[PDB]
Amino acid sequence: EFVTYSGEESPTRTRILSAALSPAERAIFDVPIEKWLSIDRSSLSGWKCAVPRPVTIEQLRPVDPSDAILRHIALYRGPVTDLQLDAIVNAANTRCLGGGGVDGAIHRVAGPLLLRECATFNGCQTGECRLTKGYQLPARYVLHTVGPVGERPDMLRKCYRSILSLALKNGLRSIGFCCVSTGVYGYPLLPATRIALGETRKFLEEHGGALDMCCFACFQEDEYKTYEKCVG
């Protein structure tokens, strides 16, 4: 029933999947993906939230409560993993089996089952998004997206469209974003930020009533200040 990939359809994956799980971990892994949104995760003996004081939707402040669109956009100074929203975004690579930066961080907080779930599919194409459970994150789901290497605006735009499409299709009402393609993938920060906000605005204009909050988590001050300058 859930759509888990925006696109069209390994010794490393084999070995990830053959690693032992406890019975309690199996119970978590076994929850069907669509049930994870609403399940009482504390009913699973193997589960815990790895973020001591998650940031909830109520705690965020939108950019402009009076604006039709900007009342649904917030900026957050901190890591995306803090956010207790329906989904957070992971900036992945095409192998989609973890890495450095935010990808590494998300995997560390979520715990080992996130990698295990990523090993059940064959990576992620550039511009597309894979949906997984979020395990020990306060957020319910992770939207793993693969940005372009280099300044390819139509593929960075596609990433945002893919993320937002999956949220719409699956009834997810709040999304925490990280910077996609900036830094190691070399997408210049200001142009990337213009695209992130532009695509999110366009989506909110077209699908008003489907999303309650798009929060841009800015782990670095330069990211935060760039988002701030682009929203006024």
Side-chain angles (χ1 to χ4, degrees):
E1 192 213 38
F2 263 34
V3 179
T4 63
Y5 188 43
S6 60
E8 296 297 324
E9 303 284 7
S10 172
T12 299
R13 291 179 178 75
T14 292
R15 289 162 179 74
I16 290 164
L17 296 173
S18 69
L21 293 187
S22 68
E25 284 173 313
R26 288 199 297 273
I28 294 167
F29 200 75
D30 278 357
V31 175
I33 193 158
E34 75 278 359
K35 294 286 118 271
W36 193 253
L37 183 56
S38 63
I39 199 168
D40 176 3
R41 301 169 289 175
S42 74
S43 73
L44 292 157
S45 69
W47 183 80
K48 61 186 180 268
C49 183
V51 175
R53 199 164 162 192
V55 176
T56 60
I57 198 169
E58 290 86 1
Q59 298 181 359
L60 295 172
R61 287 296 183 281
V63 167
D64 184 350
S66 296
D67 189 82
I69 300 306
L70 300 170
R71 66 178 68 192
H72 296 302
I73 293 176
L75 304 184
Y76 175 66
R77 308 172 173 264
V80 71
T81 52
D82 284 346
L83 299 173
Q84 188 172 303
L85 300 178
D86 290 350
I88 62 168
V89 175
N90 181 22
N93 61 32
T94 61
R95 185 190 303 104
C96 205
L97 296 175
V102 74
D103 193 2
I106 289 173
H107 282 274
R108 279 196 296 282
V109 178
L113 299 180
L114 187 64
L115 179 65
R116 201 186 179 84
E117 190 174 349
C118 288
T120 70
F121 56 76
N122 188 27
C124 184
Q125 300 164 98
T126 298
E128 306 295 347
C129 186
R130 291 275 183 188
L131 181 71
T132 67
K133 302 195 288 262
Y135 301 102
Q136 301 174 342
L137 293 160
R140 297 295 178 135
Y141 299 103
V142 178
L143 291 162
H144 307 258
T145 194
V146 177
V149 182
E151 190 171 8
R152 293 303 308 141
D154 297 329
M155 278 303 90
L156 188 65
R157 285 186 191 285
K158 192 174 177 52
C159 291
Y160 288 92
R161 289 168 187 179
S162 294
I163 290 161
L164 293 157
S165 176
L166 284 195
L168 181 66
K169 286 178 178 181
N170 297 314
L172 310 184
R173 301 195 65 81
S174 56
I175 305 163
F177 292 85
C178 63
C179 299
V180 176
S181 292
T182 61
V184 299
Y185 273 24
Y187 210 113
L189 178 59
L190 169 63
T193 301
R194 292 177 173 274
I195 286 163
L197 290 164
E199 292 295 326
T200 300
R201 168 174 287 284
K202 281 196 306 170
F203 186 92
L204 286 164
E205 286 167 0
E206 294 177 353
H207 297 292
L211 288 178
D212 301 329
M213 171 51 32
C214 291
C215 181
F216 295 89
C218 299
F219 185 73
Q220 306 192 151
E221 187 60 19
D222 71 335
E223 295 167 336
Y224 190 89
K225 289 179 73 260
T226 302
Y227 276 81
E228 194 167 46
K229 190 68 71 183
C230 290
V231 300

